[PDB]
Design a protein around this ligand. Structure first.
Ligand SMILES: O=c1ccn([C@@H]2O[C@H](COP(=O)(O)O)[C@@H](O)[C@H]2O)c(=O)[nH]1
Ligand SMILES: O=c1ccn([C@@H]2O[C@H](COP(=O)(O)O)[C@@H](O)[C@H]2O)c(=O)[nH]1
Lengths: 318, 320
């Protein structure tokens, strides 16, 4: 189960850093141009790694020397460099990551080619046995929602995803549970988001002088109990933005042992000390700190990841 | 623009039926086995049509006789029958449809292969010049959401999509407008959904005893005015479930000329007369009636589409 998988890695590497892998078009251009100019140093390092032989889509193209890809198969150049950029980031930073979070939006805008990269990326992480999150923030009626669950948990074999339950909590019956296989899956529900204008609905809406993000949080756990997730070492957790300090603390108390996923530090202006302190828990896999572009876009991603790794671990010593 | 495109087609065919194309795994097997038993009747009908030549992905596979697909390229069988089922439905029913709405969820569960089909489906509809909707209910921060706008409006060339703005209205700045291209796009935001438990947040949440779906509706239009969509013949509309009769009438009243997209009739228990009467508008493209499984799962989709077509047009007569 996901809680067992999270806990074991946390003991292995003693952090709660969640590394975000959201590659955009310029990241792929820059990666392709740097490798071309520096003798494809990082791609040749990728082709030495163990588990690249265990990806299921277009291994024939992925494993051939880069000199060939330019001159030979011009069609598949983008696929090749897109996939190798993701492998490069994973190879460079994974020792520091408790989990990896891939945002689906970044892998769909080119058509099927990016979903092939997404599949290989999740295949890669599964073989490294690193916990994964798919940031897809899915939402629909029950019958439709089943398709997301197949994609996320059967096809990609992801450990968790993000969910927007604004249309109704019952959708989690067809996300976090599969009656036909008697299987249970973990999800993070959107509670407090880092949009600058997120207060308009999450705070300025109310029931019984309770703000909406609290009502939504409590609905999420009531469904978790009904689905019996925790007994099967799965959970429904919360996405709480790094800047929402008051709510972060409001959540951690009164939901003492809930799992929190927090984005916002780095590219979106943050206070790492204050975010991690308000969300803190002994089992600090319950307070995941997502860092994306601050690592993916840094010229030395290994060094950027280590920096946040050491920063987080220093704060935890309290 | 999408308002001009909707209005021009509505005059041509005089309906507001929105046919939903949400093919599931059983639909693709059932199609494959009926074609296998019936001499590939419908697939051969698909390959005679003009515009199948205007699909962009693996057209070499789509256009070959089905006889070959079984014996030779078996890896590509599923792609072939999935894609041809969609063409079959579109060919059989497009004559009755003001718009087609494709729900993204049904095209992702097998991996990339279904996105190839989604691309070909939108290519096909674009070339028949039938207005399109992608039901993706997208939602994220501004930087991420721009990727959806590229997928929906550049890659698929859709005319509109669905949006969930619960994380914040400002995401519509990076969905319905592209500053670098000075282009504008249309969207439908979720107001009232057909989930049986949809009241719990859309209704039981409020500010100053205005219900959440009302505040969300008005935030959506304030953003439409700020972006100047209606001046560029685009709009931001509302998704209002067919069963939400009271709310339907509240929206059509206090948002008189807004565009409504209503699903729920057919597979999910509906009263078509009452839904369309509460939502009615002279320019009745402003009240799109989605029918999905009631057409796609019916053994004769053409006649089922005609059934709802004639049904809708009769109701539109009594509202004058
Ligand atoms: O409230 C939220 C929910 C999700 N994300 C996602 O988290 C990642 C943030 O990474 P970064 O801002 O560190 O680059 C992006 O994928 C973004 O879509 C947020 O930023 N805020
Ligand atoms: O509140 C909503 C919003 C969207 N849809 C979508 O409308 C379609 C309805 O299909 P059907 O019930 O006509 O088959 C599906 O794609 C579904 O995801 C709903 O049903 N309810």
């Amino acid at each position: 189960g996901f809680k067992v998988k999270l806990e074991k890695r946390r003991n292995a590497i003693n952090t709660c850093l969640c590394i975000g892998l959201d590659p955009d078009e310029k990241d792929i251009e820059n990666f392709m141009k740097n490798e071309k100019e520096n003798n494809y140093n990082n791609i040749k390092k990728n082709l030495k790694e163990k588990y690249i032989n265990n990806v299921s889509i277009k291994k024939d193209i992925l494993l051939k020397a880069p000199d060939n890809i330019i001159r030979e198969e011009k069609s598949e150049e983008f696929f090749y460099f897109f996939n190798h950029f993701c492998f490069y980031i994973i190879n460079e930073t994974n020792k520091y990551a408790l989990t990896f979070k891939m945002n689906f939006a970044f892998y769909i805008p080119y058509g099927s080619v990016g979903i092939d990269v997404l599949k290989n990326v999740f295949d890669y992480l599964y073989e490294l046995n690193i916990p994964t999150i798919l940031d897809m923030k899915i939402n629909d009626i029950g019958n439709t929602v089943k398709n997301y669950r197949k994609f996320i948990f059967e096809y990609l074999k992801s450990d968790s995803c993000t969910v927007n339950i604004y249309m109704g909590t019952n959708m989690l019956k067809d996300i976090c549970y599969d009656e036909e296989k008697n299987k249970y899956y973990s999800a993070f529900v959107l509670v407090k988001t880092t949009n600058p204008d997120s207060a308009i609905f999450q705070k300025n809406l109310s029931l019984d002088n309770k703000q909406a993000y609290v009502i939504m949080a409590q609905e999420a756990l009531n469904m978790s109990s009904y689905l019996n997730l925790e007994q099967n070492n799965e959970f429904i957790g919360f996405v709480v933005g790094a800047n929402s300090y008051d709510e972060m603390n409001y959540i951690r108390t009164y939901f003492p042992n809930c799992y929190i996923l927090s984005p916002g530090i780095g590219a979106q202006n943050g206070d790492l000390h204050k975010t991690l302190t308000n969300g803190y828990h002994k089992s600090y896999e319950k307070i995941l700190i997502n860092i994306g572009r601050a690592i993916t876009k840094n010229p030395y991603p290994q060094k950027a990841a280590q920096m946040y790794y050491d920063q987080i671990n220093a704060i935890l010593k309290q």
